[PDB]
Amino acid sequence: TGRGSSGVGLTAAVTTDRETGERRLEAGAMVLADRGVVCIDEFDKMTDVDRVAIHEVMEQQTVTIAKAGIHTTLNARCSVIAAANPVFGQYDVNRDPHQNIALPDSLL
Amino acid sequence: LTRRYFLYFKPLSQNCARRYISSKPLSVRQIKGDFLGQLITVRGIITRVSDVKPAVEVIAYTCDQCGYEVFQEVNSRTFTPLSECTSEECSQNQTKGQLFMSTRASKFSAFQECKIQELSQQVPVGHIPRSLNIHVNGTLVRSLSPGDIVDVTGIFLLEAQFVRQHDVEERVMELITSGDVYNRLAKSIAPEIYGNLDVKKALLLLLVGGVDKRVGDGMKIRGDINVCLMGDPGVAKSQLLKAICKISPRGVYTTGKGSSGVGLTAAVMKDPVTDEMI
Amino acid sequence: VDDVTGEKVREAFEQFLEDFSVQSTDTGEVEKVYRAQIEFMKIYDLNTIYIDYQHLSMRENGALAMAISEQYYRFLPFLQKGLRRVVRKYAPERVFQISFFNLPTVHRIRDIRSEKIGSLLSISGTVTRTSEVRPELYKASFTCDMCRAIVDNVEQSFKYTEPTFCPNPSCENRAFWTLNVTRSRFLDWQKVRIQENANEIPTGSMPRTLDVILRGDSVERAKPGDRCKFTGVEIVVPYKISFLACHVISIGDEINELKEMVKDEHIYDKLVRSIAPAVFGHEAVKKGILLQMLGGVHKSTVEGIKLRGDINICVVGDPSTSKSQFLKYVVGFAPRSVYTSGKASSAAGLTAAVVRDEEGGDYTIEAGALMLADNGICCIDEFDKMDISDQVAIHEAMEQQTISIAKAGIHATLNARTSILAAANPVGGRYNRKLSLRGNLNMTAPIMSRFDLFFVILDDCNEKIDTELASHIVDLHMKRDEAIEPPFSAEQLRRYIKYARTFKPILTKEARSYLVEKYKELRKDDAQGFSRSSYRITVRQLESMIRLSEAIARANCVDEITPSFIAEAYDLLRQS
Amino acid sequence: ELGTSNLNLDARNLLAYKQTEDLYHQLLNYPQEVISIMDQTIKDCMVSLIVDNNLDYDLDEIETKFYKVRPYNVGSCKGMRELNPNDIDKLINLKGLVLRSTPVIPDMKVAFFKCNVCDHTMAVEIDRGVIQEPARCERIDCNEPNSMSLIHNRCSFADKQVIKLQETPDFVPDGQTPHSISLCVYDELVDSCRAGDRIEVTGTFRSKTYVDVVHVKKVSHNEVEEVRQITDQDLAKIREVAAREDLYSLLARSIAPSIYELEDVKKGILLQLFGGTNKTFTKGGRYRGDINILLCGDPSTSKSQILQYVHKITPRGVYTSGKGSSAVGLTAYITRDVDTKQLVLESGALVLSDGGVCCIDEFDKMSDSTRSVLHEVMEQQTISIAKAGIITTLNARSSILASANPIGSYNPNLPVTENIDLPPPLLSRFDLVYLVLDKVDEKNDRELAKHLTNLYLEDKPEHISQDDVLPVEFLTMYISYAKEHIHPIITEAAKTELVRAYVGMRKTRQLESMIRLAEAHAKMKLKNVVELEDVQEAVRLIRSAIKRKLQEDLSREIMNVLKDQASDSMSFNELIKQINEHSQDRVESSDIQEALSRLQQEDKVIVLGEGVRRS
């Protein structure tokens, strides 16, 4: 859905376990599909943390994480399908085509 | 208890190793797990250091009833106070009188923890430079100032014992003899882009650095260059930056927003393992 | 060891309260007034009595007072039980408050040690902040874990307590009873901030402040921003050493020199050149500063409203003058003088801003220069760079003598009587004689009003007094020169200011008959004017010269003023 | 006879004595045992003195009275840096200044216990920091086993206080920063030591580490070093180098040989660090010889160099910069210290630098809310804080050194009072301003580039010694001797030349600045009496340190189009139009925009709307 991920986003999350008495890694999404496709609707409601994450995994086609007790890099060449809505609610030809998008130029 | 000195070790060099192995420069990715108990010489940068603190080794207890002062030995991070008397006179007695502690007869040690980090060109492709902990004691406590490269030789429980700090001619002469060394070294770096020999020629002069000048009278000027790349989108900008950081050692890629405010300056943070202000 | 001593000291205190009746007719023999005090409070039932320590110090050759004086917290329920027994036997919803006052020794905040913990103490100082009134617990209704039985638990004014055993033997547990507020007993509790006085601060030290708690009906009496004297018990707070007060009060060869200084005739001429010995020239500014320290009658009415009996002084002119030097003198000489820089102030800051405390996010009211040093001189440097809010707060404080603060649901108004020494500058700095005072001062008409005297200083190149001024400046620049020296010091001038302050003169009929002709003569200059004349003349300038008349009557120490001394005030108004 | 139970003992006397050399070498390692047995022996020798003479009833109070010993005469140490773990529970001495005094905390020497069901009381006392809590009753009326209760409001306590101390030894190693040690005082010594004084302190070093004070020295025939020690041959060299004529420029050349001349600027910072004369009255007056300097003009010259060099000269000063230092960082503030988890107070920005200089760069980019505290420290040298929790006026004895920049990017067609964008008054209160403008030309900047490449001619400047330049170590010794050994008086003989020097700027802050300037001129060259020639150069100084058509026409036109508008507003457009309308002096619409901005901002005229122009 683009909003509602329990972790830090889609790619991963940190958890504590009392079995081992330590911290383990949870893989929420994009790391599961490695060759298929992923679909994100309501792209403008998605926060900057996942935006920084998809800035890095776009052309990079991978990801990297360094956390308390681990350092590593993952490979995940997936394809994204994003669906967004404007911040004004409606859009016509006479309005400018840049500010209606509500997104940065790096994401374009 | 009567130890006036402090015992430490140091390994043999490679020059004494070829002249009739035990001291190899080890990575933290080259630890494997099974080296817990071998003397290892690790090379790396130091980012986190702590203050010098007195850690006790033996706790001294005094009594007024018997006079026999007892000494217990601690090994872990924590301990419990031995309120019960374990002397040689209170065993054959009904009375079991109170004991007190002495902060003067107890032996302490200048303990300090440090976080060694993995070297930049020694890390593999894609991996991140993970850290490791070194616990030092005694006179070595002031030999570790942050912002440097060090070679630490110690046992692996890391209890350091000794620290130090900092075919080829054919490879340089065949690069020289081809002619037009400056333009060849300019057009050799980053060839996946188009043109811009002048910008990247100044990038060549930027990564070669220059000469640091010291007047010897308490004044140091910079011997460095700082280059701006102001441009419009359409031409590649991150590729030249990535090629400069991939070719040059210790190149660190940064960003504009995020944790950048704490990613450009020291950030106070509590430490859970040792529980303190790091 | 005090379990058998408490009943004996309770018997001694009730014998002191029982053996003393009233036999005070015809100022004969003395005996204490406590039984009639209890008989007077019988109708009103407040039970907030006042017992003098000086009247208690005569029994047992003072030994009863010395034994109570160190073990006051250990003897306090025995004293209240003896008071309860004497009012239960002499008289037929019961709270009690015993207050002690008038101690022979006044202790500072820097002489508090841990040897007086639990003893009584007299603490004097100034109140910095005040808190809201809050209901204190007193006694609560605890319910059991299984019995559901009511227990009336009495707190001991320390911290949230808890019972130990259930009274009904249906249970014997010690787990958590639950509190109940229906059968509970509330009252007023206040926490104020006392601080070290400005005249007893050590050299280089900081004026250390402390928080003092107060209960009973001693609350809502202490006004913020005044010198106060408390009498209470030193109680520790988890630790910190706080205080508990029970009594509140609003405190705050010599005659051979004073009688010699009031019998001569040239005192005022040395007084106008001795009120500012570091300033060369400017006798009119020195006259207004000398007459602005002492005022006149404020209650001159038959209706019942107090009037503005104070003198407002405002100085204007070109920069780099000596007009700030007076500003630096008043605050270094007058004890009732608060100085502010003007730009480092605001509306709330000037009188009473609000700041939060995290124990419950509760507000406390910090004071300021405004509403401090009553019947003194509040001096504001740079009056024209202030905002609109503090200037209309100054106008609201000058329109009515009281000031009102409405914040967080509570409304509080208080009496204030201060004289404003306003230092202002023009919009361009240089004073041009081209136009009026209103367009050059750049402030609106109601805040320009209620000002008794304006002092305009203009400078130019006049070598004969300029060389003397520059020689006085370079002669002052040495180690304690005699050039600055006045004809007489401030040593007799302080007691002269106080002796003239407690004089209260009365004007005459001949002075009023000359005053009406003088007001007609001053208003005749408005006709065919526009030369020298620069402002309008109405009732306010008449009130200013009326207030300057009693000030010159007090300065010359005359009970009945003659119009010849008001002629100098008329000439002072004509000089401005 | 006066009741003073304290005894001040000098350990040096125990050191030089023939019989007690074994006592001085025994009390340095174990002070806790020797103080406890000294308390018994002092009482025993005092009662031996009582029994030798005829006396009244003095034995009724000395039998239960206790007396202690405060040893302080011990040698110096290198602060907390030399305090190794073999020096724990030993006597130590620290010389420095205290910065913060916490409120008094109580320590429970005793405690009451009551059996809540039968009410028998038990008093327990302390022993190395543990309080045994008895479990069950033991009396004969309450024999039953039941839980006791601790009462404290009836138990005696003792005073304790933790005090922050900024340490500074006689010798400091290279790379060492000043340290903040948390010392702790006890009874009969509380409220005797507080922030603001140079304090020598001594006690027992404990272990987080702290020092348990046995004695304080609030005051200071001895060789106790007060200032930086000099010898007779160095004093003779100072007297021989002070008799030369070119010393007045020699020092100005030796203060910074890596830069250029800067005679007025270097002479001003030289006499600024010379200080002047600080004289006071007995009760209500004080005056300090001080100058607050400001620098303005052309950029990219030695300004920051100076701003760092002086931070490397003074022993007290902070480098405050731009918008990064607000009002909560410029005086003092409360802080929740997580160490003890307590609300401590700490001084920053102006009371940390109490003495010496203080360096501020980017004065024009600084806010207006924090300018009001420097408005008081200009000549008042005081800080008056009236806020929540604190109403305190305090010392601000330091002098400011501020570097500023003009408006835009220098313009000689505009006046000096409008080009640097600040108030004239506050600037009239400034003691010394400095036009450090370049005004680039030939036969000057060529020597500048030649002197900057002359040390690039050789790889090492070993050839810096054969010129008329004093070394740094001789310079600071001469400056420290002159600042603490000369109190010059300003006589009446220099009256006549001062009056006329004032009227030339008048045809009191300038007079107060020039008398401190003249006494600093008297501070140099070893003079106790000021001389007539010494003010001449001073004035030359302030005359060389500071050395219309546009706006006029502008206003003129504005007035015109107003008039012709029936006073209505002039348009941006019409303005620009008539103003370029004249070929003669080319008013560029940007320049137009600028000067317009100036007058409006100068409040002379009002303009509104991004797209329009208003007269």
Question: How are the secondary structure elements laid out?
Answer:
This is part of a larger assembly, with chains A (108 residues), B (278 residues), C (576 residues) and D (615 residues).
Chain A: E1 13-17, E2 22-26, E3 37-41, H1 48-56, E4 62-67, E5 70-75, E6 79-83
Parallel strand pairs in A: 3-6
Antiparallel strand pairs in A: 1-2, 4-5
Chain B: H1 15-18, E1 25-26, E2 39-49, E3 53-62, E4 70-73, E5 100-117, E6 131-136, E7 149-155, E8 159-165, H2 168-176, H3 181-188, H4 197-207, H5 238-247, E9 270-271, E10 276-277
Parallel strand pairs in B: 1-2
Antiparallel strand pairs in B: 2-5, 2-7, 3-4, 3-5, 5-6, 7-8, 9-10
Chain C: H1 5-18, H2 34-44, E1 50-52, H3 53-56, H4 63-68, H5 72-90, E2 99-101, E3 120-131, E4 134-136, E5 139-143, E6 150-154, E7 187-195, E8 209-214, E9 227-233, E10 236-237, E11 240-241, E12 243-247, H6 254-261, H7 267-271, H8 283-290, E13 313-317, H9 323-333, E14 337-340, H10 347-351, E15 353-357, E16 362-366, E17 377-380, H11 389-399, E18 402-407, E19 410-415, E20 419-423, H12 437-441, H13 445-448, E21 453-457, H14 463-476, H15 493-501, H16 509-523, H17 539-555, H18 563-575
PDB class: replication/dna
Keywords: DNA replication, Cryo-EM, OCCM-deltaC6, REPLICATION-DNA complex
Entry title: Atomic model of pre-insertion mutant OCCM-DNA complex(ORC-Cdc6-Cdt1-Mcm2-7 with Mcm6 WHD truncation)
Features:
part of a larger assembly; 4 chains; A: 108 residues; mainly beta; two-stranded antiparallel sheet; two-stranded parallel ribbon; 1 helix; 8% helix; B: 278 residues; alpha+beta; 8-stranded mixed β-sheet; 10 strands; 15% helix; 25% strand; elongated; DNA replication licensing factor MCM7 (chain B); DNA replication licensing factor MCM3 (chain A); DNA replication (chain C); nucleus (chain C); ATP-binding (chain C)
Task: Describe what you observe in this structure.
- The structure is cut from a larger assembly and holds chains A (108 residues), B (278 residues), C (576 residues) and D (615 residues).
- By secondary structure, chain A is mainly β.
- Chain A has one helix and six strands.
- Chain A has one helix spanning 48-56; strands at residues 13-17, 22-26, 37-41, 62-67, 70-75, 79-83.
- Chain A has a two-stranded antiparallel sheet with strand order 1-2. Chain A has a two-stranded parallel sheet with strand order 3-6.
- Chain A is elongated and about 60 Å long.
- Chain A starts with 12 loop residues before the first strand and ends in a 25-residue tail after the last strand.
- Chain B is α+β, with helices and mostly antiparallel strands and 278 residues long.
- Chain B is 15% helix and 25% strand.
- In chain B, helix 3 (181-188) crosses helix 4 (197-207).
- Chain C contains 18 helices and 21 strands.
- In chain C, strand 15 and strand 16 (362-366) form a beta hairpin.
- Chain D is of the alpha/beta class.
- In chain D, strands 3, 4, 8, 9, 10 and 11 form a six-stranded antiparallel β-sheet that branches. Chain D has a five-stranded parallel β-sheet with strand order 15-18-21-14-22, with helices on one face.
- The radius of gyration of chain D is 34 Å and the shape is extended.
- Chains in contact: A-B, B-D, C-D.
- Chains C and D meet through strand 11 and helix 14 of C and strand 8, helix 9, strand 19, strand 20 and helix 11 of D.
- Chain C: Its main location: nucleus.
- Chain C: Residues 267-474 form the MCM domain.
- Chain C: This is DNA replication licensing factor MCM6.
